[PDB]
Amino acid sequence: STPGAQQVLFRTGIAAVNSTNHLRVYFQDVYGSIRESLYEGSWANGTEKNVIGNAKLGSPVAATSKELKHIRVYTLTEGNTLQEFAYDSGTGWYNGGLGGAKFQVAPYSXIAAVFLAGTDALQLRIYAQKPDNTIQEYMWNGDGWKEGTNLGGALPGTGIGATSFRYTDYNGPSIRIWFQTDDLKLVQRAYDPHKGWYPDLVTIFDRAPPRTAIAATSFGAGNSSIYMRIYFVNSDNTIWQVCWDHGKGYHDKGTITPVIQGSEVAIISWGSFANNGPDLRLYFQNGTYISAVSEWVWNRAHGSQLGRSALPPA
Amino acid sequence: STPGAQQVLFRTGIAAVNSTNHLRVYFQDVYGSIRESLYEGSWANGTEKNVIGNAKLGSPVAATSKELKHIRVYTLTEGNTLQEFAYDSGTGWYNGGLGGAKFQVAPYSXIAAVFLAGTDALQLRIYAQKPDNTIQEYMWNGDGWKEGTNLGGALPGTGIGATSFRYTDYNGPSIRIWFQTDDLKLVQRAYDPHKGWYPDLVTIFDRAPPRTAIAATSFGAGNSSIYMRIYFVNSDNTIWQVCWDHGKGYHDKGTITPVIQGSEVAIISWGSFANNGPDLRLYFQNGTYISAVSEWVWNRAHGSQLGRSALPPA
Ligand SMILES: C[Se][C@@H]1O[C@@H](C)[C@@H](O)[C@@H](O)[C@@H]1O
Ligand SMILES: C[Se][C@@H]1O[C@@H](C)[C@@H](O)[C@@H](O)[C@@H]1O
Ligand SMILES: C[Se][C@@H]1O[C@@H](C)[C@@H](O)[C@@H](O)[C@@H]1O
Ligand SMILES: C[Se][C@@H]1O[C@@H](C)[C@@H](O)[C@@H](O)[C@@H]1O
Ligand SMILES: C[Se][C@@H]1O[C@@H](C)[C@@H](O)[C@@H](O)[C@@H]1O
Ligand SMILES: C[Se][C@@H]1O[C@@H](C)[C@@H](O)[C@@H](O)[C@@H]1O
Ligand SMILES: C[Se][C@@H]1O[C@@H](C)[C@@H](O)[C@@H](O)[C@@H]1O
Ligand SMILES: C[Se][C@@H]1O[C@@H](C)[C@@H](O)[C@@H](O)[C@@H]1O
Ligand SMILES: C[Se][C@@H]1O[C@@H](C)[C@@H](O)[C@@H](O)[C@@H]1O
Ligand SMILES: C[Se][C@@H]1O[C@@H](C)[C@@H](O)[C@@H](O)[C@@H]1O
Ligand SMILES: C[Se][C@@H]1O[C@@H](C)[C@@H](O)[C@@H](O)[C@@H]1O
Ligand SMILES: C[Se][C@@H]1O[C@@H](C)[C@@H](O)[C@@H](O)[C@@H]1O
Ligand SMILES: C[Se][C@@H]1O[C@@H](C)[C@@H](O)[C@@H](O)[C@@H]1O
C-alpha cells in the first residue's frame, strides 16, 4: 500500500464532476472527511488540505455540476439527514442550503443528484431513500428546498443512479433514474415534460447483487434522441455496463473492469459520437495499493483502457 | 426485508461466544451501537433493548469468553483506540479497562481476542494493527493492560483470526493467529510455551481478496494434538474453510456457503470428534432479508446445513 492510499476509506462513496476533460473526484477518508482530487492536465490534491466537509462514516457521496462553475456534493450527516457542500466560481466552497431542510432518510440510503439540463437557471433534483424504503425526490428551483415526486418502493439500501439531459427539440428537461427493486432487478424510472414520470418501470438488468452500486451518465442529446450508460457491480466482482443507444434502445450489456467486493462507482462523460467522442471516465476501487481509487477510460482514440492507477492521495 | 433486519449494518462486524449450545452473537446496528443476540434453546434479543455499548461506524467486532461466565467484546472508538465491553456473571455489562490504556491503532485495523486456554485465571490476548501496519498483541494478566509481542508487518486492514488451546500434555497455553500479508497470502503465526512465537509464517492460502474477513476456531485438544478451522471470504463471494486435523496437518480447504460481497464472519465451536462432535456455527451475511445475519451449522447428525436463516432482530 502507500501512506496516501491508506487514507482512503475502503468502499468509500465516490462521485465525480467535470467540464470536458477538467475533472474533480470526491471520496471519503478513513476519518469521515470528504476530500476532492483534481485533474487539470495532471492529477492533484486529495490530501487532508483538500477537505470540503464531513459526513457520517460510510456515507453515500454524490455530486453534480454545471461545468466547473457550480459544483454540489451530497452526503449524509450523523443524523441521517441530507446535506450539501457547494462550490460557486468567485465564492469558493460553502455549506449549501440542503442541510437546513433536515430531510431525514433511511440510515442506509444512497443519494443521486442532477442539475436539470438545458437551462441557465440552477435547478436541482436529489434522490434518496426514506425510512419507508421509497425513493423520494427533493427539489431546488431557486426559492428554497422542498420535496418533489415520490417514485415508489425500492430495495432497502438500493444504489441510485441519475442523469438529466434535454432533447434539442424539447423545451424542458428530461430525467432518468435507476435503482434496484425488492426482487433484485435493476430498473429505470423516467421523466419527460409531457408525460411527467412515466407510469412504468423498465427493467435494465434481471438480477443484481443486493445493494449493488449504481451510476449513470448520458451524452449526445439530439432531436428526440439520447445515449445513456448505466454501471453496476455484478456478482462476478466486476463493473457491468448497460447501454442505451438511440435507434436501438437498451440493446447490450457486459463486463467492463474488475473491482473489489462491494466497490462503489462513479461515472462522468463529455462529448458525443458526433464530435469525436464520447469520453467516459469511471472511478472505483479495484485493490490498487489495497484502498486507492482507480480510473477506467473510454475514448475514440483507444477504446476501453485502464486510466490512472491510483488517484491522489495515493 | 423486515424493520429488524434493516437495523443490522450491512457488512457489520460479527463476533460470537458460547458455552456448548448456549450462544451469543454480537453485531453493529446502523447507528453504531453494538447489540447482542442470544440462543438459549431458542433465538431472541438483538433489539434496541440489547445494546452493550457504542463504537465507530464500521468498527471491527471481536469477542471471547470463559463459557458464559465472563464475556469481553472488543471494538474501536471514534478515536481509533481499542475499547472493551465486559460481562461478568452477577455484575452484568460494564465498560472494561482496556479503553483506559488508549491504545491507538490504524483506523482500518481489525481486532482478534482470546482468553488463554487451560486456566481458570482471566488472561487475555488482543491482536490489532498499529499505524505502521504491524500486528500488535495487547495483554491482560491481572495487573493492567500492557503491550505484548509485536508480530511484524501485515497487509493494511488485514483480517485477524485467533484461537487459544492447551494441549493436555503441556503446562501452558498455545496461541495461533492468522492474517494476510502484503502479497495477499493468508498466513499463520504460532505461539507455544517452549518456543514462544515461532519465527516462521506458515502459508494457509496462496491468494485471498484484499482485506478479506478471517475467523478461526480450534477444538479437541489432546496430547500434542489439536483440530483447527479457519474461515475467510474468497473471490467467489463464498466463505472458504481451511482444515488442520491432527495427523494430517493443513490438508484440505474448500467452499462452505455463499455470502454477500465483503461479508464479515464469526465462528464458534464445542465438543470433539472423540465425543460425537464437534459442533460448529458460522455467522455471516448472505443477503437474507437483505441485511440480516445468517447461520451455518456443522454437526455429526447432519453435517453441513444452513441454520437460522435470519438472526434476531430480523
Ligand atoms: C488523455 Se489522458 C486520460 O484522460 C484524462 C482526462 C484523465 O482521465 C487521465 O487520468 C486519463 O489517463
Ligand atoms: C478554481 Se479552484 C479549483 O477548482 C474548483 C472548480 C473547485 O474544484 C476547487 O475545489 C478547486 O480548488
Ligand atoms: C446561494 Se443558493 C445555493 O445554490 C443552490 C443551487 C442550492 O444548491 C442551494 O442549496 C445552495 O445553498
Ligand atoms: C440561499 Se440558501 C442559504 O444561503 C446560502 C449561501 C447558504 O448559507 C445556505 O446554507 C443557506 O440556506
Ligand atoms: C415541473 Se414538475 C417538477 O419538476 C420536474 C422536472 C420533476 O422533477 C418533477 O418530479 C417535479 O415535480
Ligand atoms: C420514449 Se423512450 C424513453 O426515453 C428513453 C431515452 C428511455 O429512457 C426509454 O426507456 C424511455 O421510455
Ligand atoms: C460504440 Se462502443 C460503446 O459505446 C462506448 C461509448 C462505450 O460505452 C463502450 O463501452 C460501448 O461498447
Ligand atoms: C440443534 Se438446533 C441448531 O443448533 C442451535 C445450537 C442453534 O445453532 C440453532 O440455530 C441451530 O438450528
Ligand atoms: C444471564 Se443475563 C444473559 O446472559 C449473559 C451471559 C449475557 O449474554 C447477557 O447479556 C444476557 O442478558
Ligand atoms: C475486573 Se477487571 C475486567 O476484567 C479483566 C479480565 C479485563 O477484561 C479488564 O479490562 C476488565 O475491566
Ligand atoms: C508468557 Se510470554 C506472554 O504470554 C504469551 C502467552 C504470549 O501472549 C506472549 O506474546 C506474551 O509475551
Ligand atoms: C508442532 Se506443529 C504446530 O502446531 C500446529 C497446531 C500447527 O499450527 C502448525 O502450523 C505448527 O507448526
Ligand atoms: C470430518 Se468433516 C470436516 O470437519 C468438520 C468439523 C467440518 O469442518 C467439515 O466442514 C469438514 O469437512
Author numbering:
A (entry chain D), B (entry chain C): 2 to 315
Show sentences the authors wrote.
Aspergillus fumigatus lectin (AFL) was identified in the genome of the A. fumigatus strain Af293 by a homology search using the Aleuria aurantia lectin (AAL) from the “orange-peel” mushroom Aleuria aurantia. In conclusion, our study describes a novel fucose-specific lectin, AFL from A. fumigatus, which prefers the LeY epitope, with the ability to recognize core α1-6 Fuc. The variable composition of its binding sites enables it to bind to various fucosylated saccharides, including those expressed on human epithelia. The probable presence of AFL on the conidia and its pro-inflammatory effect makes it likely to play a role in the A. fumigatus colonization of human bodies and development of the infection.
The structure of AFL co-crystallized with methyl-α,l-selenofucoside (MeSeFuc) was determined using single-wavelength anomalous dispersion (SAD) at ESRF, Grenoble, France. The methyl-selenium used for phasing was observed on the bound fucose, as expected, but also in one residue of S-methylselenyl-l-cysteine per monomer, indicating that Cys111 received a seleniomethyl group either from SeMeFuc during soaking, or directly from the solution. The complex crystallized in the P1 spacegroup with 4 monomers per unit cell associated in 2 functional units (dimers) and the structure was refined to a resolution of 1.60 Å. The AFL monomer is composed of 6 blades, each formed of 4 antiparallel β-sheets. AFL crystallizes as a dimer that is formed by two monomers in pseudo 2-fold axial symmetry. Electron density corresponding to MeSeFuc revealed six binding sites per monomer. They are located on the opposite side of the molecule to the N- and C- termini, each of them between two adjacent blades. Binding sites are pocket-shaped, composed of different sets of amino acids, although some of them are conserved or semi-conserved. Conserved Arg and Glu/Gln residues form one side of each binding site, establishing polar contacts with the O-3, O-4 and O-5 of bound Fuc. The opposing part of each site is formed by a Trp/Tyr residue that enables hydrophobic interaction with the apolar surface of Fuc (C-3, C-4 and C-5).
